[PDB]
Amino acid sequence: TDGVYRVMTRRLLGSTQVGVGVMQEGVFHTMWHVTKGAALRSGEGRLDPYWGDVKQDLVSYCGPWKLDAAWDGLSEVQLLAVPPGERAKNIQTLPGIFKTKDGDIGAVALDYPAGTSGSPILDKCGRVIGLYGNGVVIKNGSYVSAITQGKRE
Amino acid sequence: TDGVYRVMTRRLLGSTQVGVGVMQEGVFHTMWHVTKGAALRSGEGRLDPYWGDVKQDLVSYCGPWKLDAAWDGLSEVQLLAVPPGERAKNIQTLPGIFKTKDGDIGAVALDYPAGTSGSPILDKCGRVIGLYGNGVVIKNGSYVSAITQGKR
Amino acid sequence: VDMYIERAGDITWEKDAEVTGNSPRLDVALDESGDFSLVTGKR
Amino acid sequence: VDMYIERAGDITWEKDAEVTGNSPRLDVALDESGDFSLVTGKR
Ligand SMILES: [Cl-]
């Protein structure tokens, strides 16, 4: 059941992709703003949220956050972008950095439309070092996303 | 919008992929056995079948069949496989042939599970020379699909 | 029926894609139901 | 509210995938709503 998933919503006409998520070790990981804690129908039946953090913009289904890989701070990473109505694409990039008054977080300057949130960012070994889709719009209109990763406990 | 589409069905456990299709010039192309002439939900609303050939296992929505490129009989082609729950993949191959008593038809020896039918087969310029998913299972269990193309 | 379509992506040829599959030469028969035979086949 | 998930594919690294994007250095602020600022951002 491991893999990357499209988070869809049932519409009156058909369906619409609202986000992306990662299934690993029986736990479904996505961004809080994608589902806002709503239950998810799935091949395993209804899935309920297990852990959530609005400030981190993360949410976990069926179990605690399982994703633990971290950006090297030096190495190139790959975004597995799963945009609405488009085919999944790997984009390799060298991340930048967001500076917070309380610490550091990596950031990728890759611009993808609403509904791509929750796409996994990977290291060379294929582990999710974070989820895409929470960041800022830069003065020139382009989008920079933080590498949002969850505490695992 | 033109492109390759997954033909899905609404389920309690979410959705299930029953086939694949191609949108070109406002017409949706897939295999007859995928939809069996049923209407299709879409972001633009209901789509209705316009033409169908059970023997060719083809069906066309919103308009007449638009795909016309043909396998040259010599060159390598690519299957754009869109399998259920899996990522779209381009597979290049040199087609074989179905030796019918009524002619010859190119055929790709590429094996993909139920629900991939309707995936486009391409030429080097990217035009759909046919749809994947109607063929035979060989004695060794492997699957050979014809390059099914309709009349434009 | 609640069958629907969702766009999967653009249709393009891939430079340097994986090459697989043989080139068989098969004697086949096609019936009025669209089913090929050898001298189910629908996926 | 009637959201569901569908499997999109395997999670793998792509050898010699398209390399693009700059390496930014940005001072940002993150509020209790999860929104970053510069000193929507959600896609
Ligand atoms: Cl894909």
CATH code of B141's domain: 2.40.10.10
Residue C18 dihedral angles phi and psi, to the nearest 5°: -65, 135
Q: Which of A29, A57, A60, A119 is catalytic?
A: A57
3-class secondary structure, B34: helix
* Cα separation of the two ends of chain A: 22
Best of B12, B87, B90, B116 to substitute, by most chain D Cβ atoms within 10 angstroms, is B87
What torsion, rounded to 10 degrees, do the Cα atoms A132, A136, A138, A139 define? 160
Min distance B90 CA to chain C CA atoms (Å): 6
Residue A15 dihedral angles phi and psi, to the nearest 5°: -150, 160
Q: Are residues A57 and A87 in the same domain?
A: no
Q: Are residues A62 and A14 in the same domain?
A: yes
Task: Please tell me the distance from the alpha carbon of residue A128 to that of residue D41, in angstroms, as a whole number.
Answer: 21
Burial class (CB in 10 A: 0-12, 13-18, 19+), C18: exposed
Q: Which helix (H) or strand (E) holds B33?
A: helix B32-35
Please, which residues have CB within 8 angstroms of residue B13's CB and are 6 or more apart in sequence? A41, A42, A43, A44, A45
Q: Are residues A45 and A17 in the same domain?
A: yes
Q: What are the distances in angstroms from CA B81 to CA A55, A89, B21, B73, B76?
A: 40, 15, 11, 21, 16
Q: Are residues B46 and B84 in the same domain?
A: no
Q: Are residues A55 and A104 in the same domain?
A: no
Task: Please tell me the distance from the alpha carbon of residue B94 to that of residue A60, in angstroms, as a whole number.
Answer: 46
- Specify the amino acid at residue D3: M
Q: Are residues B60 and B93 in the same domain?
A: no
Task: Please tell me the distance from the alpha carbon of residue B82 to that of residue D6, in angstroms, as a whole number.
Answer: 14
Q: Of A114, A117, D33, A3, which is closest to residue B86 (Cα–Cα)?
A: A3
Q: List beta partners, residue A30.
A: A59
Structure tokens at B92: 């290049």
Q: Are residues B82 and B55 in the same domain?
A: no
Do the beta carbons of residue D25 and residue A97 sit within 8 Å? yes
Structure tokens at D38: 């510069």
Q: Are residues B96 and B151 in the same domain?
A: yes
A33 is catalytic: yes
Q: Are residues B60 and B133 in the same domain?
A: no
Do the beta carbons of residue A58 and residue A133 sit within 8 Å? no
Q: What is the resolution of this structure in A?
A: 1.8
Give the residue from A67, A97, A123 where a domain finishes: A67
Strands (E), chain A: 3-10, 15-24, 27-30, 49-53, 58-61, 77-81, 89-93, 96-100, 103-108, 120-122, 128-131, 135-137, 143-146
Alpha helices (H) in chain A, listed in sequence order: 32-35
Do the beta carbons of residue A88 and residue D11 sit within 8 Å? no
- State which residues form the domain around A74: 68-153
Q: Between β-strands B128-131 and B120-122, what pairing exists: parallel, antiparallel or unpaired?
A: antiparallel
Task: Please tell me the distance from the alpha carbon of residue A65 to that of residue A59, in angstroms, as a whole number.
Answer: 8
* Cα separation of the two ends of chain B: 20
Q: Which of B60, B117, B119, B145 is catalytic?
A: B117
Q: Are residues A32 and A76 in the same domain?
A: no
Q: Which helix (H) or strand (E) holds B35?
A: helix B32-35
Q: Which chains touch C (3+ CB pairs under 8 A)?
A: A, B
Task: Please tell me the distance from the alpha carbon of residue D28 to that of residue A102, in angstroms, as a whole number.
Answer: 11
Give the residue from A67, A95, A111 where a domain finishes: A67
Task: Please tell me the distance from the alpha carbon of residue B61 to that of residue B40, in angstroms, as a whole number.
Answer: 9
Breaks (C-N over 2.5 A) in chain D follow: 39
Number of domain units in chain B: 2
- Specify the amino acid at residue C42: K
The radius of gyration of chain A's CA atoms, rounded to the nearest angstrom, is 15
Q: Are residues B55 and B100 in the same domain?
A: no
Q: Are residues B63 and B12 in the same domain?
A: yes
Ligand 1 centroid, distance to A55 Cα (angstroms) = 31
Task: Please tell me the distance from the alpha carbon of residue A75 to that of residue A63, in angstroms, as a whole number.
Answer: 30
What torsion, rounded to 10 degrees, do the Cα atoms A104, A110, A114, A115 define? -90
Do the beta carbons of residue A35 and residue D34 sit within 8 Å? no
3-class secondary structure, B32: helix
Can you give the length of chain C in residues?
Answer: 43
Among the partner-chain residues A3, A39, A132, the one whose CB lies closest to the CB of D10 is A3
Q: Of B10, B17, B24, B16, which is closest to residue B60 (Cα–Cα)?
A: B24
3-class secondary structure, B89: strand
Give the residue from B19, B48, B67 where a domain finishes: B67
